[PDB]
């Protein structure tokens, strides 16, 4: 038999791929948020579209329906946990209200830049890829990691990194500098 493990596509490019306005806005999104691909925007678009579809299903359904109140409460709880919704944002028109910069803002590279751990989003991306961050004492190398609302206070540099002072990373080079200086002196 075949593996019963699932798999799913994360992206698509809408028809008219040379839509000028769409292209220019996406380029500005890449530039601003330190993305590597249009595919990064497309995954965020898929998440937003999933949100829009859910929100449409909820708002089309009436008040006092079991599916509607269960799914709506569950979605709002989850969106609050992800940190998409504000304090009094607890109604379906705010779920529709969500925008692509806000989803991008939940990314770890954006947060690392925001906290001032790195001096740029792209710098933050490389900092994260080079294994120097920790979230709640867990190292993560993923720049597209989406930070939960509770998690935001718990983001710092890895204690097992050279930045965390455990050892220099280039022991060889640091040793060479010490050895050469001691030999000459």
């Amino acid at each position: 038999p075949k593996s019963y493990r699932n798999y799913s596509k994360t992206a698509r490019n809408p028809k008219r791929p040379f839509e000028k306005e769409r292209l220019d806005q996406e380029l500005k999104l890449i530039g601003e948020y330190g993305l590597k691909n249009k595919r990064e925007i497309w995954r965020v678009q898929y998440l937003l579209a999933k949100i829009r579809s859910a929100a449409r299903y909820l708002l089309t359904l009436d008040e006092k329906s079991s599916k509607r109140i269960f799914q709506g409460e569950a979605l709002l709880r989850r969106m609050v946990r992800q940190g998409l919704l504000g304090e009094n944002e607890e109604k379906l028109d705010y779920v529709l209200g969500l925008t692509l910069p806000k989803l991008l803002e939940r990314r770890l590279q954006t947060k690392v830049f925001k906290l001032g751990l790195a001096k740029s989003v792209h710098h933050a991306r490389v900092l994260i890829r080079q294994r120097h961050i920790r979230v709640g004492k867990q190292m993560v190398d993923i720049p597209s990691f989406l930070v939960r609302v509770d998690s935001e206070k718990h983001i710092d540099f890895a204690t097992t990194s050279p930045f965390g002072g455990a050892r220099p990373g280039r022991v060889k080079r640091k040793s060479l500098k010490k050895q050469k200086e001691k030999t000459e002196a």
Partner: protein, 43 residues
């Protein structure tokens, strides 16, 4: 027939090397560089 003139232009035309050039920027770095290059002031 009239099969005489096949392959003409490529063989006729001068052919020159490209000349060496340093490796290009790519990815996020290239897109960032393009985003700065394009969007400030035209001239």
């Amino acid at each position: 027939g009239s099969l005489a003139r096949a392959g003409k232009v490529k063989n006729q035309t001068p052919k020159v090397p490209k000349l060496d050039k340093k490796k290009r920027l790519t990815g996020r770095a290239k897109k960032r560089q393009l985003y700065n290059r394009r969007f400030s002031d035209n001239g």
